[PDB]
Amino acid sequence: KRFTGAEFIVHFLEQQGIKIVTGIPGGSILPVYDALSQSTQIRHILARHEQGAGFIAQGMARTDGKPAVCMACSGPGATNLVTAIADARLDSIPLICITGQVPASEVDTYGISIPITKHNYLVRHIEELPQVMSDAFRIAQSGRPGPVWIDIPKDVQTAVFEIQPAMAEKAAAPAFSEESIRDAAAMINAAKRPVLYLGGGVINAPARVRELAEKAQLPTTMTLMALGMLPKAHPLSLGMLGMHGVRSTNYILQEADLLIVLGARFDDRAIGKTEQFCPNAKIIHVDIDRAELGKIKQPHVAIQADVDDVLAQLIPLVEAQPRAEWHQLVADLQREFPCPPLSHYGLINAVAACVDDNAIITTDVGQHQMWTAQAYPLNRPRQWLTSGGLGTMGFGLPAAIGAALANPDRKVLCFSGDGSLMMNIQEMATASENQLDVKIILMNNEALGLVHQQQSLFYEQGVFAATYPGKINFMQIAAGFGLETCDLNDPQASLQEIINRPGPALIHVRIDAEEKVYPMVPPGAANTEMV
Amino acid sequence: DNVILELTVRNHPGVMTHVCGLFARRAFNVEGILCLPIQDSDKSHIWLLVNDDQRLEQMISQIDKLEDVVKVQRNQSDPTMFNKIAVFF
Ligand SMILES: Cc1cc2nc3c(=O)[nH]c(=O)nc-3n(C[C@H](O)[C@H](O)[C@H](O)COP(=O)(O)OP(=O)(O)OC[C@H]3O[C@@H](n4cnc5c(N)ncnc54)[C@H](O)[C@@H]3O)c2cc1C
Numbered sequence: 102k103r104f105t106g107a108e109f110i111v112h113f114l115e116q117q118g119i120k121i122v123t124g125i126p127g128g129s130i131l132p133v134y135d136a137l138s139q140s141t142q143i144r145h146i147l148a149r150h151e152q153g154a155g156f157i158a159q160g161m162a163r164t165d166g167k168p169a170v171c172m173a174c175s176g177p178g179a180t181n182l183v184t185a186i187a188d189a190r191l192d193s194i195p196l197i198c199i200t201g202q203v204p205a206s207e208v209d210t211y212g213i214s215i216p217i218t219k220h221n222y223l224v225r226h227i228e229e230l231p232q233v234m235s236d237a238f239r240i241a242q243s244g245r246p247g248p249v250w251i252d253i254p255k256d257v258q259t260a261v262f263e264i265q266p267a268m269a270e271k272a273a274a275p276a277f278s279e280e281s282i283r284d285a286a287a288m289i290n291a292a293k294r295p296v297l298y299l300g301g302g303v304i305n306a307p308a309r310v311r312e313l314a315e316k317a318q319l320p321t322t323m324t325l326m327a328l329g330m331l332p333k334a335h336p337l338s339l340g341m342l343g344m345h346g347v348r349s350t351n352y353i354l355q356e357a358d359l360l361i362v363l364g365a366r367f368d369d370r371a372i373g374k375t376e377q378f379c380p381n382a383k384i385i386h387v388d389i390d391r392a393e394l395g396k397i398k399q400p401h402v403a404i405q406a407d408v409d410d411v412l413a414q415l416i417p418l419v420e421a422q423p424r425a426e427w428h429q430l431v432a433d434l435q436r437e438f439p440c441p442p443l444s445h446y447g448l449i450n451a452v453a454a455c456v457d458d459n460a461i462i463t464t465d466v467g468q469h470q471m472w473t474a475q476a477y478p479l480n481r482p483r484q485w486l487t488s489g490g491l492g493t494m495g496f497g498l499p500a501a502i503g504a505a506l507a508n509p510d511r512k513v514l515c516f517s518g519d520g521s522l523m524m525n526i527q528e529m530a531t532a533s534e535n536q537l538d539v540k541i542i543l544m545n546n547e548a549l550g551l552v553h554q555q556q557s558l559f560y561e562q563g564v565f566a567a568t569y570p571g572k573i574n575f576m577q578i579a580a581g582f583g584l585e586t587c588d589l590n591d592p593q594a595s596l597q598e599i600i601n602r603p604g605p606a607l608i609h610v611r612i613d614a615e616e617k618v619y620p621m622v623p624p625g626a627a628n629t630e631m632v
Numbered sequence: 633d634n635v636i637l638e639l640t641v642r643n644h645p646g647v648m649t650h651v652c653g654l655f656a657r658r659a660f661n662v663e664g665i666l667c668l669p670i671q672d673s674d675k676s677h678i679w680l681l682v683n684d685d686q687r688l689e690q691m692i693s694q695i696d697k698l699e700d701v702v703k704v705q706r707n708q709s710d711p712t713m714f715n716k717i718a719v720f721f
């Protein structure tokens with residue numbers, strides 16, 4: 102089996118089971134595209150902007166649990182991938198990003214990717230192409246996953262060489278001492294007021310995380326990245342903690358004497374001022390990345406491992422306690438806490454009444470996102486797709502497009518705002534041309550909005566450079582991209598019907614720009630200092 | 633107060649941009665760098681002069697995240713080696 106470099110790339114991608122690949126062609130990547138035209142297994146989706154290609158790859162990857170692939174040419178193609186790749190890095194998503202480059206014989210793609218990738222490559226001769234790709238796919242998916250960037254010079258793609266590529270699979274998870282699991286089991290069994298603090302890393306262990314939470318009867322809080330790890334109404338659900346979390350549980354955490362941290366990284370937006378976050382709490386911290394252990398809070402028991410393997414070795418050693426008095430305390434604090442048509446919360450509720458637990462939910466970034474995180478009943482793992490680490494405006498629509506492509510059966514609702522939706526508005530075309538089942542729920546405040554709230558609450562000269570006049574018609578635009586549109590103006594009947602019928606849709610709702618996301622923790626404050 | 637780290641890394645252009653960029657990006661203090669290829673070998677040594685901080689094992693965890701880093705050790709040589717070396721130039 103003899104190949105050209107481009108044909109080998111395609112063949113390898115086939116043997117990793119890739120069925121979809123998304124990108125945009127250009128000169129320096131045209132050989133791979135030539136080979137890719139010949140694949141009977143891999144379909145190629147043409148984005149309208151390479152940032153869109155990357156975020157669509159991201160939507161696939163955030164729903165499958167496997168790396169997704171995006172492609173671009175040198176120069177502006179590569180540079181346009183940057184935001185999508187960096188977003189992939191800070192939220193820990195397996196992406197393989199393939200870029201053509203000028204013949205080995207320009208823009209320093211390698212250099213630019215150094216600080217935003219889990220690893221990257223410049224293939225200088227074709228003989229390296231097998232190892233490179235096999236290691237890229239290993240690196241992207243092992244340990245703490247992330248994006249790997251492979252830059253391949255055109256003269257390597259059109260070379261020929263001689264070799265059978267297998268399916269690269271994940272590296273083995275770290276080992277961990279049984280004394281550690283014993284010591285954690287002892288601390289959990291002896292704790293008066295434990296809380297279970299879940300992050301985006303527990304995402305492939307819903308069974309054992311649920312089993313643990315219910316056995317030990319642990320109040321469980323989740324980060325923005327862990328919504329759905331317990332169904333919203335679950336009686337142990339403190340819901341989400343932190344900057345815009347629920348007030349009762351922000352106070353409840355300060356009562357904890359031990360917190361069990363699985364898959365979280367103590368980001369300030371969940372923790373607030375580090376030193377004032379659960380001072381009287383001993384900490385157990387289980388994380389697959391050594392570098393996260395003790396990075397922000399020092400744990401009393403630290404395990405570098407996969408959460409599943411730990412919880413497997415830990416649940417049979419954890420006693421099953423009613424924790425009755427601690428629950429009365431949780432409830433008593435909750436009986437002093439805020440609570441929630443075409444309202445913003447009412448809109449979220451109305452849209453939820455239109456779909457199953459089978460829906461996939463995507464968001465852009467801003468007030469509409471925090472509102473959705475607060476009120477939508479997210480009850481499944483890998484149902485909730487949001488950009489948290491980088492917090493990229495424009496993530497929502499292309500992410501939803503990817504999710505649709507990866508699950509053609511399901512419905513993808515994309516809660517967006519007027520500002521974020523314009524960042525990748527062009528991918529509307531991508532949605533209609535593939536006739537994908539994505540429904541954009543646009544809360545249009547004619548404002549940036551999260552900025553509007555930060556300036557109005559915290560800066561002396563108030564709102565500036567954060568408002569729009571309202572001479573943009575979003576229904577006209579979505580219609581010109583080929584989507585059905587709706588403007589609540591039975592309203593519900595129109596909503597349920599626009600959601601029920603297939604194809605991509607835009608649903609538009611006016612919202613007063615003065616509306617707020619409460620509670621808010623002012624930047625740099627303790628989690629007990631909420632507005 | 634100071635230590636040398638010895639890093640064994642794969643020799644390609646440029647692992648040094650990886651390592652240097654890591655130290656800048658994360659605000660690790662470095663007060664002397666030396667990189668030499670290891671002979672009859674596909675690897676190079678990077679020696680760094682760091683502080684023996686409370687921050688040091690976090691520094692090592694970060695460095696070990698780099699794919700090209702094959703090993704990272706605390707190197708038993710006196711830390712005042714680096715400065716003295718300047719004399720030969
Ligand atoms: C406007 C805005 C508001 C926000 N408000 C909030 C808020 O109120 N509250 C909040 O919490 N966040 C909020 N966020 C999100 C916040 O910025 C962070 O993205 C988030 O808090 C981090 O959650 P995490 O700890 O799960 O991090 P992640 O990056 O999702 O989790 C990755 C971690 O899991 C580990 N891991 C992965 N796999 C495994 C495994 N198998 N075993 C063990 N460990 C594993 C990784 O090593 C790493 O430590 C907000 C974001 C924005 C943009």
Ligand SMILES: Cc1ncc(C[n+]2csc(CCOP(=O)(O)OP(=O)(O)O)c2C)c(N)n1
Pocket residue numbers: 465466467468469470492493494517518519520521522544546548549550551552
């Ligand atoms: C690309 C980018 N630019 C700027 C920001 C800073 N920022 C975060 S939220 C936000 C406002 C969000 O606007 P919108 O889409 O209208 O959401 P809303 O607050 O109205 O719900 C801005 C400007 C960002 N996150 N991303």
Ligand SMILES: [Mg+2]
Pocket residue numbers: 467518519520544545546547548549550
């Ligand atoms: Mg808005």
